[PDB]
Symmetry: C5
Subunit: 336 residues, 5 copies
């Protein structure tokens, strides 16, 4: 029996190696397989990865006439000591078990142990949508020991920045993934003390041109279309009035459709500012012709009682485009 | 073997410590890690937290030449007595088990025991949306012993109000979280008797300006736009009629879009009152010109058979804005 | 050891108490904690409740010098006999297990046993939406023994109608819950014989005024608005025609929005009848002016070749409101 | 002990009864409790049912002084041989376990065994929506032995067509269920050989009148409304043009709303053909007046340079309704 | 006992057959039962299949007087060595267990072993929607040994390209499935070394005519309808202006409805290019009449101060259709 080469019953496997002495170093290597999905409303993402641990235990040394190693499955985990790593700020996770548990153990003759498992984890990531759709989001994944402090277990990246590997075909449907790197930081808990924590960082970006074409283009086109009425004769009321009211209706429908296709985030974003400024512009373009018509009627009635182009249109033709251009300059300087 | 230092087989671990005597005090400390999501339709929220228990058991005392403690994992839980806390008014919950069970046990030489576990719980919270979107909701989380009454187990916060800690980056997408505090209350069950219950309370608020801009602004703009027709000559029927009917259509589309983006709550809210009052105003603005046109036609026909501005417009120009301002004053005094 | 006071190994616990003799009575008490959700499309509801069983077993009697009882957790269930209750016409259910199994056992010195557990169950409930939104739905929850007939196990409510308790704050977002009561009925299975079944009944109702305001008000307003054209001069075709066609468009949009916000139930309801009758009314209001215009053109052409208000408008002004009022009377007499 | 009456340890229960001889007959009875839901997009349905097996085993015979039987729960399944039935072409299934496993075993003194369990199963069902909403779908449920061929296990319906029972109140929200019957067929696998398979068949139908009223009625009404313009004077351009363009807009909105409420099936159906033919009709009704207006302008200009009803309208008034009636006749003859 | 014919306790089943010598060949056969669903947003698909393994082990040989084999269920798996196959780039998977585990083992007298199980797996598949709806997607399923390299376990298709079988009625609601074939490729891992990987490839296609009719037809019809105004007299402003603005509104509504029914993929596709070019065309058709009207007014005013068809319309009638035809030619040459 292979388990009789390792004196399992001659040692206590409820304690860490080197109990009572210096802490044992444990190295961690991570390979990212894929990113499953990302949820903006709940602010989380799902990742599938390989987790590997490296440590040495003299109690597992066995004699041999060569340098061959022994490989064991997940059934030997319950009989030996293994590190109790867990993912910080996670919501749910599981280990794949088809067609059997995806756990592997390799033991060297001198006691070096490799422990590898395949896991899927969902972790939280706070996001800020104030600059949507020009926002940038940075999410991280954290790994920490649960019950062992820095005095008993020392956690580190085995090969520094080379310990993280990513798949060549990792991608997201609506996001761009970039800038993968690893960092470490010490965390303190008042109940037990200090812990070592490992981080995996990456950055997310959107496709700007899609949102520009879908949102900013129709609003600008409708605003420029609302300026057509300034070049129409003031005497054609049944042409000036329906044009303005239908432009208002079209802008309202465009705004509603754009809102219906965005994530349900309940605070003001830049796109909302742009759309409502456009709506205000169309509203003012309607009030302008209302005032022109009233003044024309008053003047005609006064002339009849006593017995060309209106200046308001001339000034509006210059003022409205200049105001819109100034607003666009300020907006795109603020939001880059 | 570490388990041979504790005389497990020499004691009965099916009974609580101090059986037959005074009740044993048990202290509870809670650290809130994050709030996962909140559902308005089903009236529940999801929270992830750390739960810690403190109690003393003389049966676990072991001799030692120093003051070092022993740490055990979840496998020792089944061999000793642990408190049976459960969450009241919960719908579903689970304990994380990646890469292993997130359960820790620490035993002091004098018998003091610390029992900590990481859990995710979904709990109910009744909500009232009558004052939406100016509503305020208070939700709580309750912890109680399942099988032990106050005569056998005494439950309390270990350090009073300092026993609750919250993460610095806890937030919700569409809500503001504030006013975390802890309270206790005794509960009675006729089947068994009195129990001690612990509470964790917090308050939720919305973003008012977003809803104001998205809902109240377009309705007010459309109502003010409907008053433009009072300044147009009564003789231009093909300009007065289409303007009113298109304003009605635009208001209807705005109301439908607003309803489509709100939670499916089937009772009357303040926003509905505002929108339908606006719809009634636009309807009356159409009936007014209908009456003016009919009266003008009647007068002209009578004059022809026998062979300026209509007073209704003059009175409407004053009455409609005054009525709308009065309605807004009353509404915003009632709903603050 | 507490389990050595009960002669577990001296008795066979695979058979019911009193085997070979009269059936053993078993009492059931239910406390409803909350209603989680209700699904109209799938016709089911979710409930969380406490289930308690009472029975006597002489094999569990133990000597004592006082009248104290012993409390055991879920681990003793597998060593003794317990009733095998199950929920009839259920889809899915589970027993909560955080932080441990929510199962309690209390044994009296004379052999009386109390068995309590906390369970969540999803059960079917057939619904009829013909009278929507004025429909009333009655749902029930059923409890029955699985393997024991009335000859071996007699099931009953322990305290009659007092055996059902409900939480003070039980509520639903879009429904009103009322009339909780308990009933019993005998059921027959040809494979095994008769069984005793217990019922928990309740009634659901909606909020009428919300649906009235959201649906019936806009349709009536649009129908009344379509009657405005009968008071406009027949000579203003560019005012009569666009008004009618835009009214038809507005009614169509209102009907589509109302349909988009209702549950996806694929058969005719009362609200559909109301909306389509309104649509037919607006259609006829357009055909009426078409006929008036054609007749006016024919008369003018005939007069020119040979070389006031049209009666159709006068009759329509009376006929249309009277027909609509009669339809409303009949509809609200049929649907109350 | 009841298990000592059956010589469990004196026989090998890893082999089927009658090993090495003729195959053992096994009878199956099924009672359908309810249909939970049906998914058109994923093409599957969910059913809850009772499954019963009948077979004889001489190794379970026990002496008795009467004719009473012994009932055992799910714990005896692991100690005896039971048939390994499974559902073919299923996606997911489970056995209910509240408050315990819903498994029953009854053993007669002569060795007859009844094995009953309650199960919920989701099975695939290919559907064809070409004739939607006049389509008819037939779904089936299949039961087969997993590891035993016809040479070792003979599977059949115990009582022929009487072995299937259905609940009196089984129904679906949007479907009609009818024609339940049972059939058998032999299946061949090249790896192992022939198997016996059992079928449960039923048919699904929709509610025709609901879809007719919701879809075909508005399209026909709009098409008939588009013919009104042929009776209006050609000299009223501001009445002819807006009517046609608004009719086109209304038809487009109706088509979009109808598409938004149908299942997301990506191929052409009959309703799409009807709606797009109607759209083409309205388009042609607009081109007709465009041509009439151009011809009238040309004629007037020619007459002025040189110095009644247009025939196109007269022919259109007859041609358009006749063409639409012919199309409806052909369509309803093809699609019945 | 059947398990006593196989000397289970006389051999170590923790090591592979032929340990220390040449690698053991293992053959794999796959039968695809159905495709459950496909998700475009998350880029994955679900498949149900049968997995079979073939290998020889001399340690399982048993004496017999004939050539009959022994069949064992899933309970023997834990006592013998079985290959540890797993699915690469999968997200979740499970093995069906109703009414029992769907695992079968057949052992020949000479030691040949057949191991078959029924599994459901969800796997990732990167997709590109740039050419939507004319895109073609190729997805694959990968099988690899977890812990054994090519030096210890040699994995191959048992019968080459005949080892893959597919159901006759496999289909998808919105996709066409074709070109099933099998390939192999060697993969390298720096931690352990080389592995053998098996592939199952297939291709997906859409229904072109449905998307054409739903999207390209209405846009072309609206663009052609916008050219009607070039044939209308320039003196009818209340007919030219509302037609153009309503055409713009109709195009906007069509674009919004089309966007609302497509998968939420956030980058530019071909259909978007087509729709926005059409929108630009309608915008230019409105600017053209604006310019014509302004020029006509200027000319009339100049003539009055001093005291036929406009050329712009004549040139537009030719230029606009030619430009649209050229754009369609270029677009359909680029996108085929
Ligand atoms: C947005 C709607 C503005 C309403 C018109 C403002 C009332 C001023 C008015 O009518 O008095 C005008 C004064 O004209 C101007 O002030 C020219 C500047 C135009 C500003 C418009 C951008 C009376 O006209 P008149 O005495 O003939 O010059
Ligand atoms: C909302 C629609 C109201 C319909 C018009 C009311 C009919 C009264 C009418 O026409 O008689 C009017 C009386 O005018 C008034 O009462 C002035 C007050 C205006 C109230 C309007 C806010 C007849 O006109 P006249 O005899 O010339 O003054
Ligand atoms: C105008 C002054 C402000 C009104 C305050 C409304 C408070 C009344 C209230 O909250 O009880 C409301 C009733 O609301 C209304 O009466 C709607 C009025 C319709 C207006 C447009 C047609 C309770 O109704 P409900 O919860 O559905 O039982
Ligand atoms: C819904 C559309 C009805 C179309 C008009 C009906 C054609 C009858 C017609 O034009 O002949 C009319 C007869 O008028 C009437 O019958 C008065 C009753 C009005 C009924 C309308 C509710 C011819 O007009 P005349 O000979 O001048 O009276
Ligand atoms: C769908 C739009 C059809 C455009 C008009 C067709 C051009 C033919 C034309 O204008 O020449 C017409 C010929 O009229 C006809 O052909 C009568 C049949 C009407 C067919 C309409 C259904 C010229 O008018 P005229 O020489 O006065 O008869
Ligand atoms: C008018 C007479 C009735 C037509 C019967 C259509 C049967 C043809 C059929 O089912 O094959 C259909 C083709 O349908 C059409 O041709 C649509 C015509 C467009 C009309 C409006 C533009 C098969 O198409 P598909 O399943 O997408 O491959
Ligand atoms: C898309 C909107 C184009 C605006 C009109 C362009 C201004 C040019 C203008 O008005 O000067 C025109 C010149 O006409 C032309 O250039 C004929 C070509 C028409 C090109 C239109 C496709 C002045 O008119 P006229 O001196 O009488 O010829
Ligand atoms: C007219 C001739 C056909 C155009 C072929 C477009 C191919 C270019 C391409 O695929 O790269 C596209 C760019 O598409 C456009 O330029 C949109 C043009 C807007 C037109 C309406 C405003 C890549 O863009 P993206 O994936 O978002 O980085
Ligand atoms: C390799 O194994 C041989 C035994 O076969 C041993 O003598 C030698 O020292 C080993 N070398 C290393 C580097 O482990
Ligand atoms: C790892 O590489 C990243 C790449 O930017 C760098 O920021 C980081 O400092 C590096 N860390 C170490 C420990 O080398
Ligand atoms: C600490 O441990 C020492 C033994 O090393 C013991 O003598 C001393 O009393 C302990 N002190 C406390 C406060 O426990
Ligand atoms: C805890 O602090 C909260 C803060 O408002 C207070 O309301 C509550 O009374 C305090 N309770 C105790 C026990 O101090
Ligand atoms: C209560 O317990 C006492 C023993 O302490 C016993 O003598 C007495 O009979 C009991 N009474 C009842 C009602 O059980
Ligand atoms: C229980 O109370 C309800 C209340 O209406 C009543 O209908 C029912 O008959 C009662 N049943 C019994 C057994 O008292
Ligand atoms: C019924 O049981 C009696 C014993 O009580 C036995 O004598 C008789 O044969 C049995 N009959 C049948 C039909 O099993
Ligand atoms: C069972 O009844 C159905 C009812 O139509 C029939 O079609 C079928 O042939 C019958 N089968 C047998 C075996 O009687
Ligand atoms: C078949 O079995 C017989 C024993 O019944 C044996 O003699 C013969 O060799 C076997 N043949 C093969 C091909 O295994
Ligand atoms: C299997 O058949 C496919 C069919 O196209 C072919 O492409 C492939 O090369 C074949 N592979 C082998 C190993 O025959
Ligand atoms: Cl006009
Ligand atoms: Cl619209």
């Amino acid at each position: 029996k292979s388990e009789q080469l390792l004196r399992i019953d001659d040692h206590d496997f409820s304690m860490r190696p080197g109990f009572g002495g210096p802490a044992i170093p444990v190295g961690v290597d991570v390979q990212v397989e894929s990113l499953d999905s990302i949820s903006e409303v709940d602010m989380d993402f799902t990742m599938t990865l390989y987790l590997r641990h490296y440590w040495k235990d003299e109690r597992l040394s066995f004699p041999s006439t060569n340098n061959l190693s022994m490989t064991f499955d997940g059934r030997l985990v319950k009989k030996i000591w293994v590190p109790d790593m867990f993912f910080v700020h996670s919501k749910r996770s599981f280990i794949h078990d088809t067609t059997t548990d995806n756990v592997m153990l390799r033991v060297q003759p001198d006691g070096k142990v490799l422990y590898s498992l395949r896991v899927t984890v969902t972790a939280m990531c706070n996001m800020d949508f104030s600059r949507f759709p020009l926002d940038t989001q940075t999410c991280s994944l954290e790994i920490e020991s649960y019950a062992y402090t820095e005095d008993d277990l020392m956690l580190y990246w085995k090969k520094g920045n080379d310990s993280l590997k990513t798949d060549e075909r990792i991608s997201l449907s609506q996001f761009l993934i970039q800038e993968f790197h690893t960092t470490t930081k010490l965390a303190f808990y008042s109940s037990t003390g200090w812990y070592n924590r490992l981080y995996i960082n990456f950055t997310l970006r959107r496709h700007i041109f899609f949102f520009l074409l879908q949102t900013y283009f129709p609003a600008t086109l409708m605003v420029m279309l609302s300026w057509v009425s300034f070049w129409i004769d003031r005497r054609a009321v049944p042409a000036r009035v329906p044009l303005g009211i239908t432009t208002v209706l079209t802008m309202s429908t465009i705004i509603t459709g754009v809102n219906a296709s965005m994530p349900r985030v309940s605070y003001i974003k830049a796109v909302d500012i742009y759309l409502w400024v456009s709506f205000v512009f169309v509203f003012l373009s309607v009030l302008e012709y209302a005032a022109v018509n009233y003044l024309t009627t008053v003047q005609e009635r006064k002339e009849q009682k006593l017995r060309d182009t209106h200046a308001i249109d001339k000034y509006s033709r210059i003022i409205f485009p200049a105001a819109y251009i100034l607003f666009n300059l300020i907006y795109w300087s603020i939001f880059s």
